[PDB]
């Protein structure tokens, strides 16, 4: 989950390579999109839409094995100074679009690194972020310019837990080389289903390998395969997707003077063409060119 | 005051220059696409001006490069403007030059006797791209640094002189301070002089032979 | 209106120029001041105003400090080097890549010496040349777009 | 980052014809 | 919308400034 990111990787959700740390556990890749304004004025509230689409009709494997729907999560790394807009500054229309999203910072004084935990994918394939742009006028660390926006979006259950143990939502290979003699399915302490599998035909070790039910097997019985053959499959129907984007912290004064200069240029061009027009008539008269 | 113009006229022969200029004409087949070469020049003059401007604050050192670009963007008066213009005009120069080559080729203007103009043009294209590649890495950010670290090893493929070439370009066995120093000399000293020389030849030949004929 | 001067075909110095395809600044609209003084500043100001406009509305970015120990995801040169970059990464033979790269300017240099076989200027009177040019242009755009895509979608543009 | 690319292409392509049209128009009203 | 109205209105304005300066300067025996 997003909060497992800040647990394992507290300093930042972004590695020096630009790789977002979710990928360290959500090993599959699915498309993630973003929608940010090209430019925004300072001290303004604007919409930042992260999109984590997937096939709603396709379900995934739950912790036990049951076929269940999947949730979405995301991390939105904004530029310095940017942060989630205060509720009193978000218009009604935007409020309705957001929903029950619990925006929380990645850490103390990291208000620009927003994070959004588990949300029902059926209703949140498109997460809206109300964000407030900073103001260079009252913050010497903030200035107008173009800045990056890093976005990680995931759907579906991960593959690794913060401790190291693998989840049941991944593929399972064979332990070693030998003839499979066990498609046993025992249990005991905990609950629900489990499978016991083993091999041999001579070796240098006498142990077996259990697989947490959920994936589903495609191996029958008796076969001297090697160490690495897929004896289950890939139940995973989710995946994590990265994207970079850019936003311009614009200054109204810059654009204003721009409009004026543009107008001056167009005027000058007109006067030049008209001047030529005059000279054309003069040349037509006093034939001397 | 005793006529200053006649004074300058007698020794500069301004009248002769005026006669030479007003003796030229532009034929009907010369359409708007014949501006592209001039626009490429205009883009370069913008580079010359804004580039020079940035040498007053930019510092070609691994310690100071990135921060000097930050300083230009944040602290220097209109520094953000001068740099943004250098950036966009760098790309507009190459674009307009491509469109310029499209005009020249789809008009046969490169054929006898204007083939040295075309060859000097190709050389001008290589120089312009060299401008781009060297400037791209001057900020010494992730993008610029890794753009260099990739291409700087390419020439090693050449059998005998490959490693020597690559060492000359990067200033050593690997990319580092020496690389930044050589790239900066190239971007702000070598390439401006080279492009001036070959632009001089380009323009002298054009003015000598006039524009190619109608299609 | 519309100032024009006809070619003086009674002038053997002009005729000798035209014979060498080289007298086309002797006739037409007066270059000065008609174009030079009046129209040129329109083009200079125009291009300058478009560049400034782009510069203000979409200013230059400054990424993050270089890191020799961390290779970025997404690692491209500037757009005009996409075709060359595509070739360079997609060819297993590094030497052959360097040669293909060098072949671009060297190849363009040979153009005039290859198409001097005739004196035509209009592309409609040289369909073979126009075909080779359109082909290379399409192949270059193809290689350029491929550069921004994964290596697997390069030889197909992820379309088929 | 693709609809912006197509938008910019279409605009840089089509705005030229608008400027061409306006030029021809001004030519008509002056009496070319 | 606002972009389209502004674009057409900007060009229309300056096309009107062009025509205005044209016939305007003609009337004054300047053109």
């Amino acid at each position: 989950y997003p909060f497992w990111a800040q647990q394992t990787y507290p300093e930042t959700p972004r590695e020096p390579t630009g790789r977002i740390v979710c990928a360290n556990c959500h090993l599959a890749a699915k498309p993630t999109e973003v929608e940010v304004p090209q430019s925004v004025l300072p001290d303004t509230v604007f919409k930042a839409v992260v999109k984590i689409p997937y096939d709603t009709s396709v379900q995934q494997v739950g912790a036990d094995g049951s076929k269940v729907g999947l949730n979405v999560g995301a991390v939105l790394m904004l530029p310095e100074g940017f942060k989630i807009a205060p509720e009193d500054r978000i218009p009604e229309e935007l409020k309705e679009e957001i929903g029950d999203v619990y925006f929380q910072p990645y850490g103390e004084d990291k208000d620009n690194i927003v994070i959004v935990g588990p949300l029902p994918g059926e209703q949140y394939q498109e997460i809206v972020f109300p964000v407030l742009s900073p103001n260079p006028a009252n913050d010497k660390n903030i200035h107008f310019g173009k800045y990056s926006v890093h976005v990680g979006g995931n759907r579906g259950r991960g593959q690794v837990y913060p401790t190291g143990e693998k989840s049941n939502n991944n593929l399972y290979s064979a332990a070693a080389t030998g003839t499979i003699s066990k498609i046993a399915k025992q249990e005991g302490e905990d609950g629900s289903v489990k499978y016991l599998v083993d091999i041999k035909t001579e070796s240098g070790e006498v142990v077996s390998d259990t697989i947490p039910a959920g994936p589903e097997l495609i191996v029958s019985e008796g076969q001297a395969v090697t160490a690495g053959d897929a004896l289950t499959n890939n139940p995973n129907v989710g995946g994590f997707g990265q994207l970079d984007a850019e936003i311009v912290l614009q200054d109204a004064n810059r654009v204003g003077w721009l409009i004026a200069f543009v107008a001056l240029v167009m005027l000058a061009q007109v006067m030049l063409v008209l001047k030529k027009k005059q000279v054309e008539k003069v040349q037509a008269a006093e034939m001397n060119f | 005051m005793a006529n200053v113009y006649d004074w300058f006229e007698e020794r500069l022969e301004i009248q002769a220059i005026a006669e030479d200029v007003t003796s030229k004409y532009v034929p009907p087949h010369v359409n708007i696409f014949y501006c592209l070469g001039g626009i490429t020049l205009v883009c370069f003059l913008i580079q010359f001006a804004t580039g020079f401007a940035m040498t007053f604050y930019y510092k070609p050192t691994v310690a100071e490069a990135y921060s000097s670009v930050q300083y230009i963007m944040n602290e220097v008066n209109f520094g953000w403007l001068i740099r943004s213009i250098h950036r966009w005009s760098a790309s507009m120069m190459v674009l307009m030059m491509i469109l310029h080559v499209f005009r020249v080729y789809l008009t046969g203007g490169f054929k006898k006797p204007r083939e040295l103009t075309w060859v000097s043009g190709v050389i001008l294209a290589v120089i312009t791209v060299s401008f781009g590649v060297t400037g791209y890495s001057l900020p010494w950010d992730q993008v610029g640094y890794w753009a260099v670290k990739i291409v700087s090893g390419v020439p090693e493929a050449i059998p005998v002189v490959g490693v020597l070439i690559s060492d000359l370009l990067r200033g050593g066995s690997s990319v580092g301070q020496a690389t930044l120093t050589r790239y900066y000399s190239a971007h702000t000293f070598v390439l401006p002089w080279l492009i001036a020389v070959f632009m001089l030849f380009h323009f002298l030949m054009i003015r000598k032979q006039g524009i190619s004929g109608p299609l | 209106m519309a100032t024009h001067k006809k070619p003086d075909l009674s002038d053997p110095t002009l005729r000798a120029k035209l014979a060498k395809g080289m007298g086309h600044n002797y006739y037409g609209e007066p270059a000065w001041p008609n174009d030079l003084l009046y129209v040129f500043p329109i083009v200079i100001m125009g291009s300058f105003a478009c560049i400034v406009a782009l510069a203000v509305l979409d200013p230059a970015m400054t990424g993050e400090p270089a890191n020799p120990f961390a290779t970025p995801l997404e690692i491209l040169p500037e757009w005009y080097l996409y075709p060359v970059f595509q070739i360079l990464r997609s060819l297993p033979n590094k030497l052959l890549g360097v040669l293909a790269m060098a072949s671009v300017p060297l190849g363009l240099i040979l153009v005039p010496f290859i198409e001097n076989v005739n004196k035509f200027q209009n592309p409609f009177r040289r369909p073979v040349a126009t075909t080779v040019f359109l082909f290379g242009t399409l192949v270059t755009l193809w290689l350029g777009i491929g550069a921004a895509l994964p290596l697997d979608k390069s030889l197909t543009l992820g379309l088929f | 980052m693709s609809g912006e690319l197509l938008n910019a292409a279409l605009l840089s392509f089509g705005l030229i014809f608008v400027g061409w049209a306006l030029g021809a128009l001004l030519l008509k009203i002056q009496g070319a | 919308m606002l972009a389209i109205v502004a674009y057409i209105g900007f060009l229309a304005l300056f096309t009107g400034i062009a025509a205005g300066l044209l016939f305007g300067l003609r009337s004054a025996k300047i053109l």
């Binding site: - | - | 009046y38 478009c50 | 840089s12 | -």
Partner: peptide, 29 residues
């Protein structure tokens, strides 16, 4: 946020208008 839109519009307008003034001044194209 309207000033931003007008900002981009002005770019589109000088591009278009430059074309137009070159066509007018040079009488075609």
């Amino acid at each position: 946020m309207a000033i931003l839109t007008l900002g981009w519009v002005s770019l589109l307008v000088v591009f278009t208008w430059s074309i137009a003034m070159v066509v007018w001044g040079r009488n075609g194209l």
